[PDB]
Amino acid sequence: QNYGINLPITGSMDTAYANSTQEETFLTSTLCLYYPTEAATEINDNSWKDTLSQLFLTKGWPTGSVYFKEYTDIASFSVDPQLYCDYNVVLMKYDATLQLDMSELADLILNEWLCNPMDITLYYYQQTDEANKWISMGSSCTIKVCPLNTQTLGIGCLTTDTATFEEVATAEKLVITDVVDGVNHKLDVTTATCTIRNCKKLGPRENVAVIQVGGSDVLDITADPTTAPQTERMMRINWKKWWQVFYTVVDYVNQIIQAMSKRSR
Amino acid sequence: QNYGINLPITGSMDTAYANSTQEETFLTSTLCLYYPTEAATEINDNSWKDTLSQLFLTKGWPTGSVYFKEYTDIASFSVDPQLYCDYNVVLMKYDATLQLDMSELADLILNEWLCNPMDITLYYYQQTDEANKWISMGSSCTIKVCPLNTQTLGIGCLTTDTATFEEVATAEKLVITDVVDGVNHKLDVTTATCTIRNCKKLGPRENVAVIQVGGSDVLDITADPTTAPQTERMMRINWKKWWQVFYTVVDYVNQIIQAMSKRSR
Amino acid sequence: INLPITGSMDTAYANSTQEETFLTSTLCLYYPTEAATEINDNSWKDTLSQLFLTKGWPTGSVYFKEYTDIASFSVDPQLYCDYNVVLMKYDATLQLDMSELADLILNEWLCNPMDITLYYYQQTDEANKWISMGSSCTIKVCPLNTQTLGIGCLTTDTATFEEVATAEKLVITDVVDGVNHKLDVTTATCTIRNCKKLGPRENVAVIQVGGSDVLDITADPTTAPQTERMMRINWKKWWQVFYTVVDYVNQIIQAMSKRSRSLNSAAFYYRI
Amino acid sequence: INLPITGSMDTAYANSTQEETFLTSTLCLYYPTEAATEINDNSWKDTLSQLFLTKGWPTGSVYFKEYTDIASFSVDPQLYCDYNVVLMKYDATLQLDMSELADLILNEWLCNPMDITLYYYQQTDEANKWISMGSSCTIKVCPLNTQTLGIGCLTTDTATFEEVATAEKLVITDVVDGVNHKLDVTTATCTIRNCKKLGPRENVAVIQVGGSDVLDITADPTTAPQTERMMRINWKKWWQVFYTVVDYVNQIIQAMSKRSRSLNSAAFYYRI
């Protein structure tokens, strides 16, 4: 059990495919859904959770392995999302005005970020690679940046007059900022109501699954404007009600969990 | 040093890979951004061009190589575009009501067209293949077409009565018209304001790169409805500000110039 | 990983992994408000940064996270740094608090939620404890017998329950391992979790700024150990304490080792 | 293409590509308004096209493009056709203008833009010239010395500068190649461009309708060449001119050849 190390693995091509770990992973794992308040609002039923649980019970998932966790709105969810389960599903409504925020949410939860803190009053920060971004959470973040030159002086901005800084956010609950990698930036931030963290995007999180409910696929996880990929756990649906959506999820929960895979870290 | 001849080339596979021509192509080339006036308006600054150039200087592009050329609107840009640089980037705002217009702009700039003129009042024209289209630029084009039969009589239209024609374009600044290939058409066009040209589509242009700053990817380069492709130099971003977009372009310029390659012609 | 590792005793190998990360370390101090109070300066953070720069740590690697009180810090301590140092003042009326904080941060915990009402829980081994965090946690416990009745307590009268926590923010409760207990907790103001102790956290280092060594990290009274990353200092000013820490940070860093299990921000893992 | 070509003198002279280039090419005449005025007809274009249709050129291949005057034509001429013929009226007062036009269209220019105010430029070789187009160009130039000061002119007093062009629509300017000039140009009304002269443009054909052959394309006064596609007619009418062109169009296209460098609609290439 050599943890903290990475060793060469080996195998063969003559070994046969083993049994189906389904009907056991459901029992020794847990499934957490994240629905919006609009769903329960439209529904207007108190026993819909027990109903979906008794339905899951047919697919194999036992009674107390399923969890439902409401969220009033996509931004309130983006505010410190704490996903601690063994299989997470996230039903996400589409709004053309919220596109960037509901893509930042995806880039935050679908992936696994290694996040170090940040202190703006003392230091001036720079990015090193293309995956070392700055994610800001809080209730209203107003972020301004002033890049510096080789000799610690601004570029189109002054290091005293914060009004001359360059604005990238304006009262956003979640922000993910990428800047030019190789230049030191001086920052202004609403530290009182927002925390900023310098995070490196590691390999992806195979434990969550986003399901867009409405419009066409728009989520550009990769900040670089060349890939625009569609990952396997990035699902779309077209909706007019919510019971049909929940029945679809329950009937196709095995494909979802096949698209997902228990975490590594 | 032969010109205008296509000769067989020859090489090998035991030849080794040469060095990175980046950090020299930057110095020996030129870059031209095409941003909309809304960007400058939102920014509300007058040193941002020099700021971006000083940033680019950290990526390798020298000072007198980068240029920013403004365009008030998609249609105004579409009116007689002239993209003459060694690397062109275009930031296109999304608008449902401008979908076909900004698809025709893409089909015009991304591709390379061999254009001959058109004298409507004298001749009756026809298309030979799926590439000989009719592109009309100007302030307000109002095009109407009557296909003719074997004996140069009209088909559901009267050669004399201009009103019986089939209007395919109503007061548009750029039209790209594909009609039935194999019949002789007679046109009515507001030639005082719009110039129309019979243009055969050659292979693509690898010098320009479109970047849809907003909504989903809708551009249908190919006039034919079956393929509906998406190329490498057709990018997409999600936006709420413009400083972030320009920072992203800057930080991932090398990916863009990898997606692009200088022109064959 | 299950597979084995090999070695030797004659070689001088020199062949080893080289890679990159955040810039070759990070460090975070946790100092009490009293220190900045005594100092009365608004440039001492930058002073200490430029000092650490002599020891090698670059500008954007050292951080300070002020904490008002030991209890406030114990309430949801969110450590996300590659090296953590915790200066901690001595108070004989807080021994259990600043030993529970140590047993929480120095050791690595795997915690599952708990539903007091619908269920009655128990401990399996000598490492399965119950940690409760919040603003005021008053806990009461009634052991049970084979026939699901009480023992010196009554399932109905909460007053008959036996008290183990009174007006505490962090509590680490160990009860008899192998019997079902019934619990009463201020669930409105505190959250209780059934946690299991794992291999230690080599990424934090406690520094008792004051009196003699008291921290009994191990709840069992027979060990009373003292780890390499459990330090002591004698203090009359705070500038001298910080200069000492800075002059001897390379030994602190030789005593601390980066994590092995995974990355996480809190002082315990969640596994439902 | 940097590769070689190979051939043999035993091979056979293939069939005539004429009678197929006529079908897969386009022709475009440039006539003056004077011609249409003298003719006083409206269907003369369809007439000439029906006449070309005997010579082989199909219906939708021949085009006619009116130009009010030589200078208005020299202002940004956009020749976009696979074969271009130009009918050019002689005028002593316009000799240099219709020679600059010839040097512009018959040859293939590679142009870069010129910023007068911030920078100062020089010519390197005898093919790098400064061409200015617009409604009214007026160019003044002051050459400078090694230490960035004038030569018979003052860097400030624009009147001291030496006027090379006055009230001209097209100007081709060649100065001493190897000194730095400071320019004064009506940028609001004329744009100026540093253009290198590449090989010739075999796609156009100038036909001087009146006077003797005077066009001196090559700015050096030592060649004074008469290229193949530089023709001369003597005229008393325009119908005879057009009939002559139609009856001897085959020789004209034998004297011309489709371009080699690339596809482009204007009279020059742009490289910033």
Binding site: L158, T164 | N44, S47 | - | -
Partner: protein, 48 residues
């Protein structure tokens, strides 16, 4: 006779103090921070 190349490359550090000489001998000139910025299209009050 490559000693010129070798000695030039070796003694190229002297160029730095030569530049220092030319600098302390020549004149000095420094610029100020300037603004292009946003400027408001501000008129006067409506007066009578």
């Amino acid at each position: 006779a490559s000693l010129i190349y070798r000695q030039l490359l070796t003694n190229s550090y002297t160029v730095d103090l030569s530049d220092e000489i030319q600098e302390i001998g020549s004149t000095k000139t420094q610029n100020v921070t300037i603004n292009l910025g946003p400027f408001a299209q501000t008129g006067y009050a409506p007066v009578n």
